[PDB]
Amino acid sequence: MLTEGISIQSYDGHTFGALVGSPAKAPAPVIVIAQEIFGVNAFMRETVSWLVDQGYAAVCPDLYARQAPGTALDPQDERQREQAYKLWQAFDMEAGVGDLEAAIRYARHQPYSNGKVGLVGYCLGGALAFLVAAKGYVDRAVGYYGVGLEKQLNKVPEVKHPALFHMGGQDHFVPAPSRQLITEGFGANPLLQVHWYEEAGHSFARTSSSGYVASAAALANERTLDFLAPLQS
Fold it and tell me: Is 226 a known active-site residue?
């Protein structure tokens, strides 16, 4: 579930692999994709494919490499889900942002790169998208249903580059009060855009989830593409 031979060195010397999709026509902008809690798995490969079909290059780094390199879990298997929760529980968010900065730098310098980098993250990756956005390491960032955004409101004013977030209005991770704090809080920084999908919960854009909502995924996906388009040379 990784591209053989790719090895990226992080800030502390830790190295990790990635799934890479080179673009149909180069140079192109590169999208770094931040994984869900399941590792670099099927849905990641499908995301990679999709973006390449849309004209981008894409890199999906192995964020779990600090705990167990190459993990790729099937969200449909009970035992694999348990393992995914355990890995999520022990994930170091700070180190995850550092690894993403390393993949972003890597992305900026590939031969097929136009120099522009966006980041698209889903769930653990959607929370990471916000954090990378507040660090300013990418030209544009997109987060789909990040968990815990309500606890990072103090970083709102730090965001200096555009970031778009797609959030389900029935997502149990974001009960009503949390929804209000995010809305109001993100509302203060025009570089931040948040869209709520009323009848969708978590994972609404992943076909294999029972939470899949075709209409919400389709509109969130088109808004994502529109938002990333400006990165196109």
Answer: no
What secondary structure does DSSP assign to 74-131, as a single string?
Answer: -TTSHHHHHHHHHHHHH--HHHHHHHHHHHHHHHHTSTTEEEEEEEEEETHHHHHHHH
Tell the burial category of 4 from Cβ atoms under 10 Å away from its Cβ (0-12, 13-18, 19+).
exposed
Q: Is residue 166 flagged as an active site residue?
A: no
Residues 157 and 109: their CA atoms lie apart, in Å, by: 29
Q: Which domain holds residue 56?
A: 1-233
User: What does the alpha-carbon distance between residue 52 and residue 30 come to, in Å, rounded to a whole number?
Assistant: 10
Cis peptide before 27 (omega within 30 of 0): yes
Q: Are 35 and 125 in contact (CB under 8 A)?
A: yes
Q: Which of 60, 123, 139, 166 is catalytic?
A: 123
Cα dihedral value 172, 177, 181, 183, nearest 10:
70
CATH of the domain at 68: 3.40.50.1820
Angle, to 10 degrees, between the axis of helix 124-135 and the axis of helix 93-108? 70
Residue 138, amino acid: V
Rounded distance between C-alpha atoms, residue 125 and residue 103, angstroms: 14
CA distances (Å), 8 to each of 12, 13, 101, 103, in order?
A: 11, 9, 11, 7
Which one is catalytic: 171, 172, 195, 226? 171
Annotated active-site residue 60? The verdict is: no
Number of domains in the chain: 1
Of 60, 99, 166, 202, the catalytic one is 202
From which experimental method does this structure derive? X-ray
